[PDB]
Amino acid sequence: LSTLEAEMAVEKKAVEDQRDADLEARAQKLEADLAELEAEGAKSDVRRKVRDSGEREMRQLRDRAQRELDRLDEIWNTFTKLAPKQLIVDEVLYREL
């Protein structure tokens, strides 16, 4: 159980590091792009729809990373409480187990 939990933590962390790395890159990109938008004369509502679109593309990146964090936690919880007579309907989960 020790080495397994240890390998699971690292795995779950590797996903976390990536989410952070990716999320800061998309934020700097938006900072660069809102910079050109102020450089040129730009309508105010146009500068906000760039941030709105940029903010939404970030929530996607985090949500996707959250999904994998939950899929990984479901794997680890299932395996640790695993007992005979339990029923597994996922089969993509089961394949990972």
From Swiss-Prot:
It comes from the Bacteria. Belongs to the RNA polymerase beta' chain family. The RNAP catalytic core consists of 2 alpha, 1 beta, 1 beta' and 1 omega subunit. When a sigma factor is associated with the core the holoenzyme is formed, which can initiate transcription. DNA-dependent RNA polymerase catalyzes the transcription of DNA into RNA using the four ribonucleoside triphosphates as substrates. This is DNA-directed RNA polymerase subunit beta'. It comes from Mycolicibacterium smegmatis (strain ATCC 700084 / mc(2)155). The gene is rpoC. The chain holds residues 148 to 244 of 1317 of the full protein.
